[PDB]
């Protein structure tokens, strides 16, 4: 009972030794394995967690059952913490650890860690983009007549084309790309703009010019078949038309189905932001709520 404890601590150590024993030049070379490319340490690492069960066998389970799960989780955590400092490219590591628990789905701790680590890096990428976009938009709001486009042309666009997107391509998971685009378009740009107090004629034109540059940097043709990616760009493009259209063209667009992607409240909100109250804005707003109602 305290004898078993001593043996489990000694093999726990043998595992940590086995992790430290992985040659440094394994965290840097890549092998092809089935084709995905993982870091070479991956196959050595896999043995550690097999050897862990093997070491549990040498006192079974039953004698190990009560602590089994904790110590198992702990070793995954130690490994993850350790290898995080060893692998240069946060994205190779994500793939490296993903290869680990695909081959051995017993590593639940490793997938929790790996995915939470994934979220962190996405959030870092989102944070960078959130600030750039809020800054450009602030710049626009406060300098209608002669706004400075530098944030967008020198910081945001290059960031997307040359850093964030090529980084995210490495993950081999088009789902993540689509989530980023969806976030940027809806939760970030469109949400931000909808909260302006009012949107002047000049600002509307500026905002439209912004959206077009933005679309240029959110173009990932490989995603052309995914519905949420296509609809995200469509809404932006349509918002671009709305922002610079006279009241009559907005009603015609409604009629032609172009606001398919817009909830009725959102359509009325755009109109309230872009046009001064007049008989015309009223009739137009009441008409849109009415036709959508009858639908």
């Amino acid at each position: 009972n305290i004898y078993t404890t001593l043996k489990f601590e000694s093999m726990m150590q043998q595992r940590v030794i086995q992790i430290r024993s992985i040659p440094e030049e394994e965290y840097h070379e890549l092998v092809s394995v089935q084709p995905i490319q993982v870091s070479v340490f991956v196959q050595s690492a896999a043995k550690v967690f097999t050897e862990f069960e093997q070491g549990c066998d040498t006192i079974g389970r039953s004698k190990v059952e009560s602590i089994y799960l904790y110590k198992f989780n702990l070793l995954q955590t130690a490994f993850f913490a350790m290898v995080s400092e060893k692998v240069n490219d946060w994205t190779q590591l994500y793939k490296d650890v993903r290869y680990l628990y695909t081959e051995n789905p017993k590593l639940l701790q490793l997938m929790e860690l790996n995915s939470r680590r994934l979220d962190l890096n996405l959030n870092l990428i989102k944070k960078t983009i959130y600030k750039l976009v809020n800054d450009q938009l602030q710049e626009l709001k406060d300098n209608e007549r002669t706004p400075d486009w530098d944030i967008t042309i020198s910081s945001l666009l290059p960031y997307l084309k040359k850093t964030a997107l090529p980084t995210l391509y490495k993950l081999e998971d088009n789902t993540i790309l689509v989530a980023l685009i969806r976030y940027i378009v809806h939760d970030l740009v469109i949400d931000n703009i909808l909260h302006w107090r009012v949107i002047s004629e000049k600002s509307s034109e500026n905002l439209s010019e912004f959206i077009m540059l933005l679309l240029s940097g959110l173009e990932i043709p490989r995603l052309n078949l995914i519905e949420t990616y296509r609809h995200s760009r469509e809404k932006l493009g349509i918002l671009s038309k709305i922002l610079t259209a006279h009241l009559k063209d907005i009603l015609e667009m409604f009629y032609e189905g172009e606001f398919f992607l817009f909830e009725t409240d959102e359509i009325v909100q755009w109109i309230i932001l872009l046009f001064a109250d007049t008989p015309t804005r009223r009739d137009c707003i009441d008409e849109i709520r009415r036709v959508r109602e009858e639908a």
């Binding site: 940590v16 030794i17 913490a81 350790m82 400092e85 962190l120 959130y130």
Partner: protein
């Protein structure tokens, strides 16, 4: 007769009180062309036969002196106008030798001594009543000369009992009597000279207390300088001319600290006593001099003269004297003079001087109560090295570097609070096996030092080099131990930023140093990194770990998992996990923290 018989009666029977000129017939009779009454004449003459005028005249002078004692020159007419040789020089000498001095004494002291008692008087009491310049000229000399009593008088009167030299007037009489005894002497000469030397030898102390000493010493040298090659006095004490010259030269040029008697005793003391008496003389004189140079220059003329040997300090070498002097000047903190002396006698790189200088450096060093350059003992330690520097580079070799450096860190250390108890530079040597203990105390008491690795680092390595502490490529390791201390105190001072930069730099140095260093860093120092990973700032807004700090702490711990003792892998991992969970719970986009 017989003319004998004619003169005899004329000598007794002619009335003593008659004028002598009434007897002048008796001389010219010489100068050119009851019968038992003879018993009485020969009774008076005392059987003396009376053979001629000159014989007659001594007898007649005496027989009349009987009755007219007040006038010994009574018969001067009879001998004054005497024609060629009727009186021998013997007679006239008696007049000059006896009658005249006698008369002069009589008529000075209102006395009436008879010629006969005057002659038969013990010379001892004769001199004694002569003593209570005229007196010497026409009483003493004429007497001494006639009786040939020079050696006698000299011996009994010209000695140390009569010439104490306690008073100016006594001295002045010593010189008068000397001069006229010298005049009247040409073997009693050696007694006169032996006694001058004897008088001076016992009474130099009385003489040195007299006025116009310097003038008196010259006066005496005037005399002494004529004396023979060698003189003997008293016991069996013998002084040569060369010795006398140096002795006197010593009193006149250099010092009257020692009497003549004492000087002679130093001559015959053992080497050890002589050296002691020599340094005594140097210390006393250095401390009386307006300027040490003036007394040095005087010694260069005499007792420290390389051109001739010293007949005073006869048993000690120039080197021993100069050494003694350097030791005296060091204790006196007279560093300039030390230099001058070293230069003059060409002691550059001398082993014995080196060691004396070094010995004194440590003396000053250990006496210091702090290390600041201004502290008086550190100043003297410094001045002692500047001398080692200027005049001992060769013999000092690498040792000068060390000592110069030890002084430097002593100054630096005294600019910070130390409480290993104030802090003496001499305590630094006490930490020779644990130099880091000094650095630790500094980091603790001086709350901003953890930020200054550059200087804490030159202190530490200065202490290794100055104390000749071994560093067998153990200097990589040492730097590391130093840096972990800085991390320790950065955390202590709530400065995670500095802690982390150091912690990151340490992991690197060790990564290169190789697996040996990485195991060492781990087994020895893991607790510092665990603590960094566990660190909590009380001042943190909302008691919440700032997001950027969480991340850094996670990375340190993960780096720690590579090298920490295997026993510690659980708790290190646990913390890592605690930080990872809190991190997963923050909105990184709109982050209320970091």
């Amino acid at each position: 007769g017989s003319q004998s018989k004619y003169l005899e009666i004329l000598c007794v029977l002619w009335p003593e009180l008659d004028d002598p000129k009434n007897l002048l017939f008796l001389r010219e009779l010489e100068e050119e062309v009851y019968h038992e009454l003879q018993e009485f004449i020969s009774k008076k003459l005392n059987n003396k036969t009376l053979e001629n005028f000159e014989e007659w005249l001594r007898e007649r002078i005496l027989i009349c002196n009987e009755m007219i004692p007040e006038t010994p020159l009574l018969y001067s007419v009879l001998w004054e106008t005497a024609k060629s040789k009727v009186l021998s020089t013997k007679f006239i000498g008696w007049v000059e030798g006896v009658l005249k001095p006698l008369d002069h004494l009589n008529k000075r002291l209102h006395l009436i001594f008879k010629i006969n008692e005057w002659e038969k008087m013990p010379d001892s009491e004769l001199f004694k009543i002569i003593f209570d310049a005229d007196v010497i000229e026409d009483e003493l000399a004429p007497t001494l000369s006639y009786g040939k009593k020079w050696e006698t008088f000299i011996t009994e009167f010209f000695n140390k009992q009569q010439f104490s030299l306690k008073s100016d007037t006594n001295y002045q009489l010593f010189i008068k009597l000397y001069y006229s005894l010298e005049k009247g002497v040409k073997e009693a000469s050696r007694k006169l000279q032996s006694n001058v030397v004897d008088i001076l030898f016992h009474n130099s102390e009385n003489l040195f207390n007299l006025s116009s000493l310097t003038h008196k010493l010259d006066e005496l040298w005037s005399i002494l300088s004529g004396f023979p090659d060698e003189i003997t006095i008293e016991e069996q004490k013998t002084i040569t001319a060369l010795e006398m010259k140096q002795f006197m030269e010593f009193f006149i040029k250099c010092s009257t600290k020692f009497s003549f008697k004492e000087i002679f005793a130093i001559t015959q003391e053992e080497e050890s006593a002589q050296l002691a008496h020599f340094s005594s003389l140097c210390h006393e004189e250095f401390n009386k001099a307006n300027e040490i140079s003036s007394f040095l220059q005087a010694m260069y003329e005499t007792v420290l003269d390389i051109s001739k040997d010293d007949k005073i300090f006869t048993r000690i070498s120039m080197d021993e004297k100069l050494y003694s002097i350097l030791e005296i000047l060091l204790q006196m903190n007279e560093f300039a003079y030390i230099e001058a002396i070293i230069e003059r006698f060409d002691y550059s790189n001398n082993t014995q001087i080196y060691e004396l200088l070094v010995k004194f450096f440590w003396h000053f060093f250990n006496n210091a109560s702090n290390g600041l350059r201004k502290e008086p003992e550190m100043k003297k330690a410094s001045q002692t090295l500047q001398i080692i520097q200027k005049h001992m580079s060769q013999r000092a070799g690498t040792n000068l570097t060390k000592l110069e450096v030890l002084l430097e860190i002593s100054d630096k250390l005294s600019h910070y609070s130390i409480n290993l108890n104030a802090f003496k530079p001499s305590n630094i040597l006490e930490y020779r096996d644990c130099p880091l203990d000094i650095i630790s105390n500094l980091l603790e008491l001086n709350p901003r030092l953890y930020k200054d690795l550059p200087t804490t680092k030159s202190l530490l390595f200065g202490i290794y080099d100055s104390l000749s502490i071994n560093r067998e490529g153990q200097t990589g390791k040492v730097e590391v131990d130093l840096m972990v201390l800085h991390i320790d105190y950065a955390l202590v001072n709530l400065d995670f930023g500095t802690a982390y930069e150091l912690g990151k730099q340490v992991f690197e140095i060790c990564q290169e140093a190789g697996q040996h260093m990485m195991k060492a860093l781990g087994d020895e120092h893991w607790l510092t990194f665990y603590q960094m990973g566990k660190f909590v700032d009380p001042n943190w807004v909302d008691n919440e770990i700032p997001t950027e700090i969480i991340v850094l702490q996670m990375s340190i711990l993960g780096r720690l998992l590579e090298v920490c003792p295997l026993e510690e892998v659980e708790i290190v991992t646990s913390q890592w996990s605690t930080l990872e969970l809190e991190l997963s719970a923050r909105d990184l986009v709109k982050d209320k923290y970091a």
